[PDB]
Symmetry: C3
Subunit: 45 residues, 3 copies
Amino acid sequence: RMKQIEDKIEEIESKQKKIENEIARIKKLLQLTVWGIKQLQARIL
Amino acid sequence: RMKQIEDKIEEIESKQKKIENEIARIKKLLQLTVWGIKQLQARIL
Amino acid sequence: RMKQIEDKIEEIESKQKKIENEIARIKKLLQLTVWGIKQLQARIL
Ligand SMILES: [Cl-]
């Protein structure tokens, strides 16, 4: 039961890395969308 | 101690699945916002 | 090996909370971008 536990922990850590990488990508795209909205605002105003 | 650990793993995995679900929803809305910005850009240009 | 597991669990939980908090911040910004897009739509149309 300790080895199974260790394996499940390694899997959780692996998925946590995936999650952190996805959050980083989402933040970069979100920043681009903010910039794009601000550009459009300037062009409209 | 090993039953407490096993139970805490199951809880962590549950929370991780909630997080994954929430990220999927965020990504879908973010994609819609990208489409909406692109439509505005094309309209104005 | 149970103590090392318990310490890894604490670290995983620590990170999971940070991830949850970051998702909450992303959601707040994404709500503001949706609002900003709708404002531009209304003005253009
Ligand atoms: Cl997580």
